C-alpha cells in the first residue's frame, strides 16, 4: 500500500530530493492553521533558545493577529524562566487572552517605514527577534509584502527572523526580487497543497545577505513543493513508532524533540507525547 520508511522528515526545502509537475486540479483539521503557526514558531524560538539568542530578547511579531497560539508560546518560555518581551503589531486586533500581561504589548496599527523607525528608537538597545506573518494574494501583492519585510529587517536590525515565505507562481511571474538569506523551514499541517514555508535567518553584522529569486527558482519551488504535498505528505511512515504515523506527525515529532521542558521524561517519545497533548489540549484539537 502507500506507506513508507524514512530516516528523517523533510525539515528544510533544500532537503526535498524530487519533483513533480504541478496540476491545476488539486487541510482537514480544526484550528490547523493555528497548530501550523504554533509548531513553526515553537521550533523557531526553541532554536533561538538553544543557541543563546532568545534570552532577554524582545520578540517583534508583525501581522500577529489573531495570534491565539502566541499565548502558548509565551506561557511555554515564561515557565522555562527565559526572559522575553513580546511585541505584537497588527492592523487588526489580537485574541483577548493576550491582554492583561505585563510582558506582552499589543499594538493595533498598520506598520509603514515610518512606524518601524519609531519603535526601533524605542526598543533600542534591546536585542530584536522578528517574526513576520504579514499579508494583504497576487504576485504584485507578494512582492510589495516582501519588499516591506526587507525594510523591516534593515530598520529593526534583528539578530534573527522568521518570515512568511511563499514564492510567486511561475505562470504569474512579474519580475525578480531579493529576500534575506536563510533556511526555508517546511511547515507541517499546512494546507494540503500550500507551498508556503518559513524563511529562518540568524544575521551576522553587515548585510542581511540578500539573494535573488528568479522565475526559474519559482518553478523549482512549485515542483519540489507539489512533490512534497502530493507524494510525501500523503504517506504513512511505517518506521515511526507513534500513536499517529501520518507523515505530518512524523514531521511534527522531529520539531518537538528539539523543544525544551522543565519536566523530565525517560525517552524523547515521552516528551513529544506530552507536548503534543499539551498543544492539542490548548488549541482544543482532539
Amino acid at each position: 500500500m502507500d506507506v513508507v520508511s524514512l530516516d528523517k522528515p523533510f525539515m528544510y526545502f533544500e532537503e526535498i530530493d524530487n519533483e513533480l509537475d504541478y496540476e491545476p486540479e488539486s487541510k482537514k483539521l480544526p484550528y490547523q492553521g493555528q497548530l501550523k503557526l504554533l509548531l513553526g514558531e515553537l521550533f523557531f524560538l526553541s532554536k533561538l533558545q538553544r543557541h543563546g539568542i532568545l534570552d532577554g530578547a524582545t520578540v517583534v511579531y508583525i501581522g500577529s493577529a489573531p495570534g491565539t497560539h502566541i499565548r502558548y508560546l509565551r506561557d511555554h518560555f515564561y515557565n522555562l524562566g527565559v526572559i522575553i518581551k513580546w511585541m505584537l503589531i497588527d492592523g487588526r486586533h489580537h485574541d483577548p487572552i493576550l491582554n492583561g500581561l505585563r510582558d506582552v504589548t499589543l499594538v493595533t496599527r498598520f506598520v509603514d517605514e515610518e512606524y518601524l523607525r519609531s519603535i526601533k528608537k524605542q526598543l533600542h538597545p534591546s536585542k530584536i527577534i522578528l517574526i513576520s506573518d504579514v499579508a494583504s494574494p497576487s504576485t504584485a501583492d507578494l512582492l510589495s509584502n516582501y519588499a516591506l519585510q526587507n525594510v523591516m529587517i534593515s530598520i529593526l536590525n534583528p539578530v534573527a527572523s522568521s518570515l512568511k515565505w511563499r514564492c510567486p507562481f511561475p505562470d504569474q511571474w512579474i519580475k525578480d526580487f531579493y529576500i534575506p538569506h536563510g533556511n526555508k523551514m517546511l511547515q507541517p499541517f499546512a494546507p494540503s497543497y500550500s507551498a508556503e514555508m518559513r524563511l529562518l535567518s540568524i544575521y551576522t553584522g553587515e548585510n542581511m545577505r540578500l539573494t535573488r529569486v528568479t522565475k526559474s527558482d519559482a518553478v523549482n519551488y512549485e515542483k519540489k513543493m507539489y512533490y512534497l504535498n502530493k507524494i510525501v505528505r500523503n504517506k504513512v511512515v511505517v518506521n515511526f513508532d507513534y500513536p499517529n504515523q501520518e507523515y505530518d506527525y512524523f514531521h511534527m515529532y522531529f520539531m518537538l524533540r528539539t523543544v525544551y521542558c522543565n519536566k523530565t521524561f525517560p525517552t524523547t517519545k515521552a516528551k513529544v507525547l506530552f507536548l503534543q497533548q499539551s498543544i492539542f489540549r490548548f488549541l482544543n484539537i482532539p
Partner: protein, 447 residues
C-alpha cells in the same frame, strides 16, 4: 460578578472601565494575593530577619508596615503598567517565598602549592560591595543545604568547603529558579532595610541577574539554568550541598586564563590563584590518580587561527573520535553556519560552557567567548591553545565521555614552562542587548 468583586477588593475601588478590561485576565492571581495570609508572612520575614540580619538596625513595627503597605499599594496606583508590576511581584511572593526563604525557618540538613606557583608564574606572562554581604552569605550557607536540587555552588566557597585555607566573599551559584529566588531575596532585604534594592539583568552574560542596593553596591549574583543542564553538570556532594565538581571547575579556570583580563588580574597579585589552583590540583591528583611529570607529550592539541574568518581549527584526532574542532570567535556566525547545516540538535549548556557543541560529518563546531592570545603573527599562544582544550574537555565531562588522558597531559604541559610574551589578542564578539531591571519602589520592570 466574581471578576468585578475580586478586582474591586484588590484595587479598593470600583474597577474603572479600562482597569477591569485589563485586570480581568489576572483575576486568578489577584485572588491568591487577596487571600494570602499576610500575618503569617510578616512572621516569616521577622524570623528570617532575626536569623540572618539580627544586626539590621530595625524594630518590628517598621517591617510590618512596609509589608502591609506593599500588599496594598495597588490601592493608590492608577497607572495600569504599574499595576501589572505590583501584581506580578506580589504573586511571586504569594506563591514562592515560603518555599524558598520560608523553609529557612528550622534549619535541617596542600603541598602542591609549589607546583601551582610554578604553573602560575609561567602564565603571569604579561603587561599589567554592600555591608549586607556577610548576612546574605550566611543565609546562602543554609540555603544551599536546603535546596540541593535547585541551587548548587561553584567557585571560592565551594573550594573553601574542601580546604578551609581559602578566603571568600561572593558565594557563587547556578539555579533553576534565579528570577524567583532573587526577587524573594530582594523583597526580604527591602522589607528589613526599609530602603530600596534594584535587580538587573546583564546582557552579554547568559541568564544572569544581580541584586544591588540603593547605591549600586553589588549584593549577590546568580545564573539561571534549566533542569536539563543542572542534571548533566558535573557535581559533588559535600556538607549537604552540591558543588560543581572541582575537576570541572579546574577546566573552567584553564579556559579563563585565556582571557586578557584574567592574566591582567593575575599580575596584580599572583598568589590569589595559588591557593585555589593548589586545592583543585590536589583533588584531581587524589581523586582521579593523575601524576605530574613534564608529561607534556603532545599538549596544545595544536591550534591555528584563521585571522579573517575568526575561526581557530583545533586538531583533536589524537584524543577524540572527531578529527578536528572549529572554534568560532563569533557566536552569531557559529549559529548561522549550524543553521546552514540543518543541524537542530546542537548540545547547549548555557552559562556553564557559554556555548553549544555540534558534531557533524565528524567535525566539532563550537564557540569560545574568551579572547585569543597570540605568540606572534598569526600564532596561538600556548595559554589559549591550552584554554581551547579545556573548553572542549568541558563538553566531554558534560557528556560523560573520555576526559582523563588529555586532562593529565594538559596539566603536565603547564609544568616547567617559560613565560612567553603576548604579541596580541583577538577581541571577543560584541554581545548586544538591553540592561534590563526591576525597580520595586518604582513599580517598573524593563527587559
Amino acid at each position: 460578578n466574581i471578576t468585578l468583586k475580586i478586582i474591586e477588593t484588590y484595587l479598593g475601588r470600583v474597577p474603572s472601565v479600562n482597569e477591569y478590561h485589563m485586570l480581568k485576565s489576572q483575576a486568578r492571581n489577584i485572588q491568591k494575593i487577596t487571600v494570602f495570609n499576610k500575618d503569617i508572612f510578616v512572621s516569616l520575614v521577622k524570623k528570617n530577619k532575626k536569623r540572618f540580619f539580627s544586626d539590621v538596625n530595625t524594630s518590628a513595627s517598621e517591617i510590618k508596615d512596609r509589608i502591609l503597605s506593599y500588599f496594598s499599594k495597588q490601592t493608590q496606583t492608577y497607572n495600569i503598567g504599574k499595576l501589572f508590576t505590583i501584581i506580578e511581584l506580589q504573586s511571586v511572593l504569594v506563591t514562592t517565598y515560603t518555599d524558598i526563604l520560608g523553609v529557612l525557618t528550622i534549619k535541617a540538613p596542600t603541598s602542591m602549592e609549589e607546583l601551582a606557583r610554578d604553573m602560575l608564574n609561567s602564565m603571569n606572562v604579561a603587561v599589567i560591595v554592600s555591608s549586607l554581604v556577610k548576612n546574605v552569605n550566611k543565609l546562602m550557607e543554609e540555603y544551599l543545604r536546603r535546596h540541593n536540587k535547585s541551587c548548587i555552588c561553584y567557585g571560592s566557597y565551594s573550594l573553601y568547603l574542601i580546604n578551609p585555607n581559602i578566603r571568600y566573599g561572593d558565594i557563587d551559584i547556578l539555579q533553576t529558579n534565579s528570577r524567583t529566588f532573587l526577587i524573594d531575596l530582594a523583597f526580604l532585604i527591602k522589607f528589613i532595610t526599609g530602603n530600596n534594592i534594584i535587580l538587573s539583568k546583564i546582557p552579554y552574560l547568559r541568564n544572569y541577574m544581580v541584586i544591588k542596593d540603593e547605591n549600586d553596591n553589588h549584593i549577590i549574583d546568580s545564573f539561571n539554568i534549566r533542569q536539563d543542564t543542572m542534571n548533566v553538570v558535573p557535581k559533588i556532594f559535600i556538607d549537604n550541598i552540591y558543588i560543581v565538581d572541582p575537576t570541572f571547575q579546574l577546566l573552567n579556570m584553564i579556559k579563563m586564563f585565556s582571557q586578557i583580563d584574567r592574566l591582567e588580574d593575575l599580575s596584580k597579585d599572583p598568589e590569589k590563584f595559588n591557593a585555589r589552583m593548589a586545592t583543585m590540583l590536589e583533588y584531581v591528583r587524589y581523586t582521579h590518580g593523575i601524576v605530574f611529570d613534564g608529561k607534556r607529550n603532545n599538549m596544545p592539541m595544536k591550534c591555528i587561527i584563521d585571522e579573517n574568518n575568526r575561526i581557530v581549527t583545533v586538531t583533536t584526532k589524537d584524543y577524540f573520535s572527531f578529527k578536528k574542532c572549529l572554534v568560532y570567535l563569533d557566536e552569531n556566525v557559529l549559529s548561522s553556519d549550524i543553521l546552514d547545516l540543518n543541524a537542530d540538535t546542537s548540545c547547549d549548556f548555557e552559562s556553564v560552557t557559554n556555548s553549544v557543541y555540534l558534531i557533524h560529518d565528524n567535525i566539532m563546531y563550537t564557540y569560545f567567548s574568551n579572547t585569543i592570545l597570540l605568540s606572534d603573527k598569526g600564532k596561538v599562544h600556548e595559554i589559549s591553545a591550552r584554554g581551547l582544550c579545556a573548553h572542549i574537555l568541558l563538553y566531554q565531562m558534560l557528556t560523560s565521555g573520555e576526559y582523563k588522558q588529555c586532562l593529565s597531559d594538559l596539566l603536565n604541559s603547564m609544568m616547567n614552562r617559560d613565560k612567553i610574551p603576548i604579541y596580541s589578542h583577538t577581541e571577543r564578539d560584541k554581545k548586544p542587548g538591553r540592561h534590563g531591571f526591576i525597580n520595586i519602589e518604582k513599580d517598573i520592570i524593563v527587559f
